[PDB]
C-alpha cells in the first residue's frame, strides 16, 4: 500500500496548500501603501498561506523521510490514512480558524506520526 | 532519465534558493532601528528569500512524491525538463520583479504538473 | 548506511524545528492588540520558528534529492554525519543567537553538501 498510500497524500499537499495560495492571489486592496482591508485581507492571505505550508514542511518532509524505506503494510495504511487523514481534516480545521482548535490537532501527528517513523524503523 | 532528472533540478533549488538567501545577507542597512533603505533592503530580500523558497516547498516536494515511484521515461524527460524547465525560468522571471508576469507562469506547473503527477499514477 | 544515515537525521528535523514550533505556541502575551514582549516575544518565536525551518527546507529537501540514488557508503556515512552534523550543532547555534555565528556554518553545508551530492552523482 505504500504505493497508494503515498499518493492520496501528496495531491492533497499541492491542492491544499496551493489549490489556496493561488486563491490568496491578490483580489486586490484598494492600493496606496506600496510606496479595514491590507491586515485584515493579509491576516488571511499571509495567515493562510502560511498554515496549508508549514503543517506540511515538516509533515511531509518526514512524510517520505521515512516511507523512503517502505514500511510493512498493515499498519502503514492506517498510519499513513490516519496521516494525511487529521492533516486534511485539520488544514482543512486552521486556516477556517486561527487560535486553538488545531494547533491541538497539529501536535498529535506531526510530533507523533514522527518519533513512529523514527522509531519504527 | 529519471536519472538525470532528478538531478540537474534539484542542484537549481539549494543554488536558485540558497545562492541567493545568503547573497541576500545584511550587506547592512546602517542600523538603528532594533531596540529609504530597511523596508525597500528587506522588501528586496525578504520578499526575494520568500519566493525563490515556496516555488519549491511544494513544487519540488512534490517534484519527488511522485517520481517516488519512478515513471516511464518518454514523457519525463518532458514534464521534468518542461518542470524545471518553467519554474527556472521562472525563478528568473518573479525575483526581478514582484507583481504580475510570473504568478501566472507560477500557475501551470505547480498545480499542472502536481494534478497530473498524481493523476497519471 | 544510507539506511541508518537518513534516519538519525530526519528525526531531528520534526524534532529540532518541531519540538521547537510548539514550544514557540503562545505562552501569551498580555494581549490587546488584534482589533515589551509581541515583538520581543516574536523576535524570539517568529525568528526562532523561521530558522528551524529554512535551515531544512532546501538542506533537508536536498538532504534527500539526492540519495534518491543512493550513493556508495564509505564516503556517506562522512557527508551525512558530517552533513546533519552541522546543521543540528547549527540549529543548536543559531536559534540562541541571531546574527553573525551561524549564517557562516549554515552556508558550508546547504551549499557545499548540495553542489557535491549534485556532482558526485
Ligand atoms: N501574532 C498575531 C497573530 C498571528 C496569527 O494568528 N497568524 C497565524 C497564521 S493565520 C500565524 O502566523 N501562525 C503561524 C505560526 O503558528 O507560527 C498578530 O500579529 O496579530
Ligand atoms: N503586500 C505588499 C507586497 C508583498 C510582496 O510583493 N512581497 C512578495 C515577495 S517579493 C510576497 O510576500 N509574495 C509571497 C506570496 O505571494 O505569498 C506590501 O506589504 O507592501
Ligand atoms: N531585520 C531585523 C532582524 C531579523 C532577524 O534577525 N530575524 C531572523 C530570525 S531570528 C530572520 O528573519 N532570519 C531569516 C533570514 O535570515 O532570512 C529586524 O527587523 O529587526
Known amino acids: ?5 503515498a499518493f492520496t497524500s501528496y ?6 496548500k ?3 495560495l493561488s486563491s490568496a492571489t491578490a ?15 493579509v491576516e488571511r492571505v499571509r495567515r493562510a498561506h502560511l498554515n496549508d505550508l508549514e503543517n506540511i514542511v515538516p509533515f511531509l518532509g518526514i512524510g517520505l523521510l ?8 498493515s499498519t502503514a495504511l492506517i498510519h499513513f490514512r490516519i496521516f494525511v487523514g487529521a492533516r486534511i481534516y485539520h488544514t482543512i480545521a ?7 482548535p488545531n494547533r491541538g490537532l497539529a501536535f498529535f501527528v506531526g510530533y507523533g506520526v514522527t518519533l513512529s517513523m523514527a522509531y519504527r524503523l
Open 1 to 5: 500500500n505504500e504505493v497508494l498510500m
Open 11 to 16: 495531491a492533497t499537499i499541492i491542492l491544499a
Open 18 to 20: 496551493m489549490m489556496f
Open 27 to 41: 483580489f486586490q486592496r484598494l492600493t496606496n501603501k506600496v510606496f479595514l482591508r491590507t491586515d485584515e485581507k
Open 66 to 73: 521515512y516511507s523512503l524505506s517502505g514500511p510493512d503494510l
Open 94 to 100: 486552521y486556516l477556517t480558524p486561527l487560535p486553538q
